[PDB]
Every structure is written in C-alpha cells, then in structure tokens.
C-alpha cells in the first residue's frame, strides 16, 4: 500500500529519494484520512459526464469511440474500481484552446 | 518575484520597508499553496460574470462601456495570462453598499 505510493512518487518525479519526499509524506496522510465515497458504484452518471466533456471539447466523434472502448473494459473482468480511474481523467481534462498554469520556482513566490 | 511581493506588501501598507516581514512571510505561504479555480482560462466566460456583477450594483452604463474596453485591451496586447488578470480583478471587486464598519475601535477587540 505504502510501497505502491513510493513507486508513484519516485518514478514520475525522478530519483532524489529526499526531493520526492514531499509527495510521499503527502500521500500516506491524504489516503489514511477516511471519508465516505461519493461518485461510487454509479457508472451510468460517469459515462454520461465524459460524453458531455467530449461534446464541450468540440469532439463529438471521440464520444462514440469512447463508448465502444468502455464496453471492452467490462468483458475483461479486471480492475475492480473502474470509476476511480475515470473520475481521475475527467478532473485533468482540458480543452484544446488554452493550457493551465505551468511555472517553476514557485517557492519564490 | 521575492522583490515583487515584498514591494507589494510595503506599497499597500503605505510604509514599512522591512517591518512588513511578518505579513510577507504569510503572503509567501498562501501563494505556495495551490488552487483549482472554478473556470480556468477562456476569455468569454470571465467577461460574462463581470457584466452580471455590473448590473447587480446598478451600473449598467459601465457594463456596456467595459465590453469595448475588453476588445481594446486585447488589441493592445495578447497574453495567455489575460484571463488570470480579469478573474483577479473580479474577485478583488468592492461593493458600494453599507459602511465598512469602524476600524477605529474594531482594532482594539
């Protein structure tokens, strides 16, 4: 559980093992603090939501394509909590017409 | 950026050139935290909220005026940070209504 989180931190950020520290302290703390689930085991609301997202991104074609790949996941029978990865993707969606804040040396501000 | 935020603190208080260190330390903390703003980029969406706000304080003539000013603003310079300035101003707006209490006795409590 921990080992998993460490591997997420170290890998993406690269090996400081003391400069990936921040994320790791952050990670254990955030998951351990319990809350009761919201958007869970209601996959019908989630599919609809991603289709609206596509409609918004001016990609109507990608919404029918997505629906086809979605049904392909069901038959495999693996990945217990499908909704959680879908939920993640949607949060980080962005439209092809802007780009969100990128800056570095943010500590100085 | 260190210089710019320190000068920001000194200017607003109208004085204190190394006595605003404490306020500064706070400001460095807030900025170092992260946000997810509801509505991220895209010039149309912010202009629409500003007009509604103008109507609400009963300054109609100002809403119409601003829209010309927005097209003008663009023409004078084009950013990818245009939206962040317009949203910044939006949040930082002041209502004409009510007295803003006393500060001449509110300091003491």
């Amino acid at each position: 559980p921990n080992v998993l989180l460490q591997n997420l931190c170290c890998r993406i950020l690269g090996k400081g093992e003391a400069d990936v520290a921040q994320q790791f302290q952050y990670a254990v703390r955030v998951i351990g603090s319990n809350f009761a689930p919201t958007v869970e085991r209601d996959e019908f609301l989630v599919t609809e939501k991603i289709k609206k997202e596509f409609v918004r991104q001016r990609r109507e074609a990608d919404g029918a394509l997505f629906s086809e790949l979605h049904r392909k996941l069901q038959s495999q029978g693996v990945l217990k909590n499908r909704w959680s990865i879908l939920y993640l993707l949607l949060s980080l969606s962005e439209d092809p017409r802007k780009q969100p804040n990128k800056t570095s040396s943010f500590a100085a501000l | 950026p260190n210089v710019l935020l320190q000068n920001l603190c000194c200017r607003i208080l109208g004085k204190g050139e190394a006595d605003v260190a404490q306020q500064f330390q706070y400001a460095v903390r807030v900025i170092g935290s992260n946000f997810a703003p509801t509505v991220e980029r895209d010039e149309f969406l912010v202009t629409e909220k500003i007009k509604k706000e103008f109507v609400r304080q009963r300054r109609e003539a100002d809403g119409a005026l601003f829209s010309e000013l927005h097209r003008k603003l663009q023409s004078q310079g084009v950013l990818k940070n245009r939206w962040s300035i317009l949203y910044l101003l939006l949040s930082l707006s002041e209502d004409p209504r009510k007295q803003p209490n006393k500060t001449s006795s509110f300091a003491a409590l």
Partner: peptide, 24 residues
Amino acid sequence: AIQINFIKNMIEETLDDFREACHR
C-alpha cells in the same frame, strides 16, 4: 407526465454540473 419528465431531466443536468463543481 411527459411534461413532468421533461422538467425532471433538465433539473438533473444542472445538479450534475454543480456536484462536480462542489467536489472540486
């Protein structure tokens, strides 16, 4: 009854956008 469903369906759409907003 169709006329009720129509209003129902609209309302659902506005609450979904708010749910995700309130979640953010």
